[PDB]
Amino acid sequence: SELDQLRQEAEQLKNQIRDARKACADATLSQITNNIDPVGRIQMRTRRTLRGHLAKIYAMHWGTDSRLLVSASQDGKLIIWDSYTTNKVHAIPLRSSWVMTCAYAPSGNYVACGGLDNICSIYNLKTREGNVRVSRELAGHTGYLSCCRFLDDNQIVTSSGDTTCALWDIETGQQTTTFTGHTGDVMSLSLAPDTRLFVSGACDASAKLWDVREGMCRQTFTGHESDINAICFFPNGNAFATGSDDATCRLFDLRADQELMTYSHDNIICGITSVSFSKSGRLLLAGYDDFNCNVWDALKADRAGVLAGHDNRVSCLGVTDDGMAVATGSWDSFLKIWN
Amino acid sequence: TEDQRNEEKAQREANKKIEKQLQKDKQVYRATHRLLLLGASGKSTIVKQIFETKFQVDKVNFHMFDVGGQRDERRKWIQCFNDVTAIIFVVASSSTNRLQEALNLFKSIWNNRWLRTISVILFLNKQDLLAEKVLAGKIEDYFPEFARYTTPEDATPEPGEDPRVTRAKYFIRDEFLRISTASGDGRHYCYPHFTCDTENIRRVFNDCRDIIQRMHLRQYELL
């Protein structure tokens, strides 16, 4: 006569949360965007189809110079590519071959990665002794790693498959703070443009707005209906759109605190795996499992464009920090550049 | 622009060094047969003749990966194992209803849309424990069609083993075979075995050789 009391009280809490979400929801975005003009048929073709990988590319992150890009494979390679002259800059052989994430630092001096080895390995690129080598390894998780991101040159934030995100300091080498509260595998992170608070999409059909300062789940978004695979904050920081296995994208916002937009057609039946925005925030790029990448209008929910291309599914997508290119990394061992 | 061209030439030299290193890694990758082990440890007699295991049989190098240090929501890391060659699915065949959930995990591995090209080596340990389990009277409480599943005509049992033991043994073998034939186009085949101690890696090597040969015959459209 104790446990049921607070869980029906939690049900009542969820009831007034839903009442507060409904009462502040006078007009959806899709009915007040009909006054603005669509962006028409957007053609983008392959500028450089960079070919270096022996196996499927599972992750990718552009550099803040919008020139270099890390690509990690289940080959066991992490090869750092120069996107203009379509050639290699580094090739790091990893410790465990199954890696699922990679992150090029905003300074450029480090590259983190991690996979089923439960360890975030941070490689240095600016060693005075020449060759690249593992500057730090981070081992405090009990599940795998799905997405790691650099807040700055000094501290990483990791998403794991044991319901935890984590802020790690690299110099100390242990978890500065944890982030618990999910119930499923936490599949993707997204840092805000001011890097004070990150959004985490997981396998409980929810996305939690955390914050790295004091370390708590300040917001929680339950609008999806399947496992959320990828997430990316809107370029201002007030919204984020995220995609899940139910073959849709959903745009949420961090202040109105509900779902704003749903992106799904009748041909869209494959659960998606990557989202990103343009620099303006108008094009929600989303890479899927029907081997294509839809280019959604992030304000009017139309298929503005369709990236054709890859022979197997995509698994990572990244837009440059000046908005110049859309790199899609896939399972046919290539990653192509779109523009 | 002189130092531009010299920097581009140095970058192209780095490109050629990395490209020849990656073709050497292609020649060591495309001949490395790797296999997922996903059964309740026990591989200590498979390695000796924490996650991975690089061993070798007859100039063919295998890369076993054990997944004991993950959670049991398997639906997100098991999608990493696409280019893997075989899945050693180990069934502790007697001890609850472990067998039906093992069948459900095998059905889920079988019908997953990113694992519908790779094949499952199927080991079944504890067959002596299943022998004293069928001689005690408990699979008949779990499986009703076992009451009328007659012993097959293509049986290759142990000479001297009790007929109820081989009855339950080939019953659950054909139940895994019913799952692995009820949904498939011939892209991948379950390879059942029964063990436990002996050279299990000989069965692993023969079955992975059969997987590679059937894949090469499917891509010539001979099979």
Epitope: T163, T183, G184, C203, D204, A205, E225, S226, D227, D245, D246, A247, I269, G271 | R71, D72, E73, R74, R75, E101, N104, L105, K107, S108, I109, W110, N111, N112, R113, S183
Partner: nanobody
Framework: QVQLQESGGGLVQPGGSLRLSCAAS????????MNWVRQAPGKGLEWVSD????????SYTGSVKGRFTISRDNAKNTLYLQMNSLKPEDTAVYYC?????????????????????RGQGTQVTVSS
């Protein structure tokens, strides 16, 4: 929000009949194959039944073959499980876990009590 409210069950003499149901709201019910899982006291979660997206391809666990029957209605967004000829082995906490993807034929929801898309649970105790 994916929520799964189940109702039914209680104290029934073994040999009678019983009925569980669960309403499923938060998604398109017409696209997920559905399951029924149970937790026996002193054991883990064990699978009982599956049904496909439409309702044709049904499957049961071996211990309930002929005894139990599940049936889904997307027009009501709910699922019913009829327990005919109840047994003393059926004293368990009952769960209607769904499967996490549209238009698929695989499920990974017999976990060690950590799954998000699963109901709260109905205790069905079988005594004298």
């Amino acid at each position: 929000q994916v929520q799964l409210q189940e109702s039914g069950g209680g104290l029934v003499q073994p040999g009678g009949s019983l009925r569980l149901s669960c309403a499923a709201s938060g998604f398109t019910f017409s696209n997920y194959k559905m399951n029924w899982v149970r937790q026996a006291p002193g054991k883990g979660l064990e699978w009982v039944s599956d049904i496909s997206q439409s309702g044709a391809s049904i499957s049961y666990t071996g211990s309930v073959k002929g005894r139990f029957t599940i049936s889904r209605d997307n027009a009501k967004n709910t699922l019913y499980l009829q327990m005919n000829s109840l047994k003393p082995e059926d004293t368990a906490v009952y769960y209607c876990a769904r499967c996490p993807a549209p238009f698929t034929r695989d499920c990974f929801d017999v976990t060690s009590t950590t799954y998000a898309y699963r109901g709260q649970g109905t205790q069905v105790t079988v005594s004298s």
